[PDB]
């Protein structure tokens, strides 16, 4: 398997990147009967899902990693077979309602309500139990729920709290409505420091010999990962296999292709500011959108690449960030992203000229 | 049976003499009934003005005890699609009236929720069977009605209830419920009514429930404000004075103290300050433009939630910055 999954902490004691967070998780798992609904939020790739699985392993014991995929089928108002994969475990369930689109309301209203209605009585056990009495449902990407699946959950996880518990993983919990955040215990997961990422990469290159020339090459990957442990571990494997398992100080850091294309677009915007350049930028944006890359991330990386240009004055950057905020708000409240993604670029070139 | 009913349903008018506020519409429909020729009617107005109470009392006056078999009342609670119009309404209009009261009456309550196909199909049922049936259309929004349907209907506008009508109905309610109301409490109730009798009755019922002893006790303005959770007329003036005269720390303290005194929300304070600043003699024409535009955005943001303290500070800053233009 990939080094991101192979070297994954499978227990609460194997976590080694945040210790004030691991202690809070141990405090939560000490008495699992009264565990409230949890909402883990933080940057992407910090280890939020790994920590959720480690907490579930501390609560229900080993075996929560024995995952099987049970394909479900749903029908909306106008008869149409809509399919959702449900990765399930003998003690917990993982669902991604965002994968089915705007119709995640029917998934939340049927699957989650049917799970929350089954008491999970098992053999007797009608009094209580630390495990196997209540159930854990993991809702990955809680941010992409379309404000109606979040309304069907407010009473679902409140009335049926005795037989079900929810642990939802999310980043930047702004599009999560206030009633959902009120019913839940907010758990902040900070990103690992560069020293911690370097230590984890050192452990990886110790278990698998890649012949590290200098400890600085692991630090460069950590600084290029911007706090993303999964990305850092992916670039480690990339520069490992692309250099015959021998990392040198001159080894280039491999970055995603869409990031390079966004940087090229930024340089084109800085160099050429005209209508035809705007049309070429629209072609680049369409090509980027054809790869199912979300438009908010396109705008975010484009803005933070334009703010890194050394030939731009402070007045230009203060206008770029303002246009970025305005068009991000427009993109959030919109249907088609090309209009806003082109308007931001047009205003940027109209300001830089 | 009628004593276990909400006051908005217990005090529903049964005759045309109990409908107050709308004098020109009643004095016209009564003559229409007296001559016996009732045209196709259209009742338009704000909610809680007395359109349904008027049309049901009118039908009772025309038909007496035959209201059951002579009046077809279809509203938003029943399906009123193209098939319903083409079958139920058409066979009700086409069949005879057993020579009971001459013409039939079809009351289409909440016709603004009706689809355009049904309203277009009803045009040749309204003007074809008009000899034996008459249509009454009750609506609150005239933009959802087709222009032809508006053309084939005599439009009567139900104005918001005047203060005198509210006082006359409040007197009857107080006499029936053996309740006492101070003049200032009546003033507060009428200003909070906004031309709605249902709100008046709902607030009066809560005020009676609020009293420890329903008799020998008078409902004051304090009781009404406590029950409905509205700011007193002095709290709004104090907040506005603190914002307009005091500095940014004292105004922030005064707003928070006033709100925490009685758990006052920000939206009612915003509306009260808007109403107080409406009769202000501004002299710049930009103070009003900035005030209305900023307060409307704050009001819209409150409707979608957010941080309350930030919105209160935004109100204070908007007023302070808009009044910088005036001087």
């Amino acid at each position: 398997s990939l080094w991101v999954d192979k070297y994954r902490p499978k227990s609460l004691n194997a976590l080694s990147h945040n210790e004030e967070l691991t202690n809070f998780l141990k405090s939560l798992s000490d008495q699992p009967r009264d565990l409230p609904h949890l909402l883990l939020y933080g940057p992407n790739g910090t280890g939020k899902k790994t920590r959720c699985m480690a907490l579930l392993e501390s609560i229900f014991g080993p075996g929560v990693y024995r995952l099987k995929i049970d394909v479900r089928q749903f029908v909306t108002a106008s008869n149409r077979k809509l399919e959702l994969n449900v990765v399930s475990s003998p003690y917990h369930l993982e669902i991604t309602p965002s994968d089915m689109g705007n119709n995640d309301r029917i998934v939340i209203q049927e699957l989650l309500k049917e799970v929350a209605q089954m008491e999970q009585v098992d053999f007797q056990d009608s009094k209580d139990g630390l495990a196997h009495r209540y159930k854990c449902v993991i809702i990955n990407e809680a941010n992409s729920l379309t404000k109606d699946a979040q309304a069907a959950l407010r009473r679902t996880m409140e009335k049926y709290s005795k037989n079900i518990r929810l642990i939802m993983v999310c980043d930047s919990m702004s599009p999560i409505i206030a009633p959902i955040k009120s019913r839940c215990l907010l758990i902040r997961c900070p990103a690992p420091s560069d020293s911690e990422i370097s230590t984890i990469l050192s452990d990886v290159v110790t278990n698998e010999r890649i012949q590290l020339e200098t400890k600085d090459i692991l630090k460069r990957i950590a600084q290029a990962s911007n706090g993303n442990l999964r990305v850092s571990l992916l670039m480690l494997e990339s520069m490992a296999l692309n250099n015959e398992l021998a990392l040198k100080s001159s080894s280039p850091i491999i970055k995603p292709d869409w990031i390079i294309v966004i940087h090229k677009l930024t340089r084109k915007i800085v160099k050429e500011r005209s209508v035809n350049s705007l049309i070429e930028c629209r072609a680049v944006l369409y090509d980027l959108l054809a790869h199912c890359i979300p438009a908010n991330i396109i705008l975010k990386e484009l803005t933070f690449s334009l703010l890194d240009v050394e030939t731009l004055n402070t007045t230009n950057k203060s206008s770029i960030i303002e246009y970025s905020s305005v068009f991000d708000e427009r993109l959030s409240l919109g249907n088609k992203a090309i209009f806003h993604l082109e308007g931001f670029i047009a205003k940027v070139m109209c300001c830089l000229d | 049976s009628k004593e276990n009913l909400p006051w908005v349903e217990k005090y529903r008018p049964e005759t045309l003499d109990e409908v107050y506020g709308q004098n020109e519409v009643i004095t016209t429909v009564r003559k229409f009934v007296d001559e016996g020729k009732l045209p196709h009617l259209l009742f338009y107005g704000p909610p809680g003005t007395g359109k349904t109470s008027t049309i049901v009392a009118l039908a009772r006056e025309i038909y007496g005890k035959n209201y059951s078999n002579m009046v077809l009342e279809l509203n938003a609670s029943d399906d009123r699609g193209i098939d319903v119009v083409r079958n139920q309404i058409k066979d009700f209009a086409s069949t005879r009236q057993i020579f009971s009261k001459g013409f039939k009456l079809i009351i289409l309550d909440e016709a603004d929720a009706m689809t355009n196909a049904a309203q277009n199909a009803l045009r040749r049922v309204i003007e074809r069977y008009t000899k034996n049936t008459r249509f009454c259309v009750l609506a609150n929004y005239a933009h959802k009605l087709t222009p032809a349907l508006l053309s084939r209907c005599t439009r009567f506008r139900f104005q918001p209830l005047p203060q005198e009508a509210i006082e006359r109905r409040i007197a009857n309610v107080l006499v029936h419920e053996k309740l006492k109301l101070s003049p200032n409490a009546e003033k507060a109730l009428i200003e909070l009514s906004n031309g709605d009798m249902r709100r008046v009755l709902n607030v009066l019922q809560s005020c009676k429930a609020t009293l420890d002893n329903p008799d020998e006790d008078e409902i004051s303005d304090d009781v009404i404000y406590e029950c409905c959770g509205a700011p007193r007329p002095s709290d709004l003036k104090a907040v506005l004075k603190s914002i307009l005269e005091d500095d940014w720390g004292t105004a922030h303290y005064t707003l928070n103290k006033v709100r925490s005194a009685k758990g006052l929300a920000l939206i009612d304070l915003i509306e009260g300050i808007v109403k107080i600043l409406e009769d202000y003699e501004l002299q710049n024409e930009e103070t009003r433009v900035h005030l209305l535009t900023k307060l409307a955005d704050i009001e819209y943001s409150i409707s979608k939630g957010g941080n309350d303290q930030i919105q209160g500070s935004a109100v204070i800053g908007a007023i302070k910055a808009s009044f910088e233009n005036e001087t």
Binding site: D70, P90, L93, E119, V121 | -
Partner: protein, 292 residues
């Protein structure tokens, strides 16, 4: 681990039905089965709490908490030789019910074709195979159904549920061969003509009266029984599923001494038996699906 046995259907016409009822009801219940070949009693076990390869998503996404615990005496088979180093020569296995049930259908049909040939079951050497062999009357049929050798520690985790008797009231269901048997079978399966019923509210009021209440329709339906019912030994009620009642319908149709055990809002136990003469008792433990 030496496990060998021979079954001949013609000599005893009751023990073959006893075994067929287990092999069919376990296959209908869930995938694969446990066969505990003790030195004197065979214990076919179907449980979601274990089974090793039948404990995937049992009481997780379908509410399958039903546990069947049957018992086959050693006198059923013709030769009962069990050799194992475990306690009382215990040999616990786990094989699928598909191949085993198909093989039993083939053997039963071979019998229906007019044959007297026996069947030989062996264990041809922790994963093994079952050497089922028989013939017509000299066509050869060999079926090496895969099987495993689930450990003694894993065996110990498989314990029969302990049913209390503080509030339990037994109900002696009438024999199917009797006059009231067909009527009672029809009353049992009467709840199956409504395709939108998922839960069944059993009720017994003490001459006991057995009542079935359905509250999942626009109307309130109560399926009652005015016939004679015996209580071997206050209203005790339990809400169970519909498939758990269908399997009980089949068990009642396949047996005579059937006891309906009802725990108040706790469980429902369907105790079947076959007094051959020790006794091949079939016990199904069903848990409440909802609260009263």
């Amino acid at each position: 681990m030496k496990l060998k046995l021979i079954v001949n259907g013609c000599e005893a016409p009751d023990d073959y039905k006893l075994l067929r009822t287990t092999i069919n009801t376990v296959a209908s219940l869930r995938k694969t089965a446990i066969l505990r070949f003790n030195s004197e009693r065979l214990t076919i076990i179907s449980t979601p709490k274990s089974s090793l390869n039948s404990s995937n998503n049992g009481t997780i996404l379908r509410g399958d908490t039903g546990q069947l615990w049957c018992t086959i005496p050693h006198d059923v088979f013709r030769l009962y030789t069990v050799i194992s180093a475990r306690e009382l020569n215990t040999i616990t296995m786990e094989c699928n019910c598909d191949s085993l049930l198909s093989v039993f259908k083939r053997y039963d049909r071979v019998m229906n074709q007019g044959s007297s040939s026996n069947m030989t079951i062996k264990l041809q050497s922790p994963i093994c195979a079952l050497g089922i062999t028989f013939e017509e009357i000299v066509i050869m049929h060999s079926f090496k159904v895969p099987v495993k050798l689930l450990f003694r520690a894993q065996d110990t985790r498989i314990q029969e549920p302990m049913i209390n008797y503080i509030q339990l009231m037994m109900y002696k269901l009438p024999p199917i061969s009797g006059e009231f048997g067909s009527a009672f079978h029809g009353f049992i399966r009467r709840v199956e003509r409504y395709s939108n019923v998922n839960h069944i509210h059993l009720m017994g009021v003490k001459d006991v009266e057995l009542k079935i209440i359905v509250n999942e329709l626009d109307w309130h339906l109560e399926i009652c029984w005015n016939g004679p019912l015996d209580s071997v030994i206050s209203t005790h009620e339990v809400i169970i599923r519909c498939k758990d009642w269908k399997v009980c319908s089949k068990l009642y149709a396949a047996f005579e001494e059937v006891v309906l055990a009802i725990s108040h809002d706790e469980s429902c136990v369907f105790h079947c038996s076959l007094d051959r003469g020790e006794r091949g008792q079939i016990i199904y433990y069903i848990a409440r699906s909802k609260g009263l």
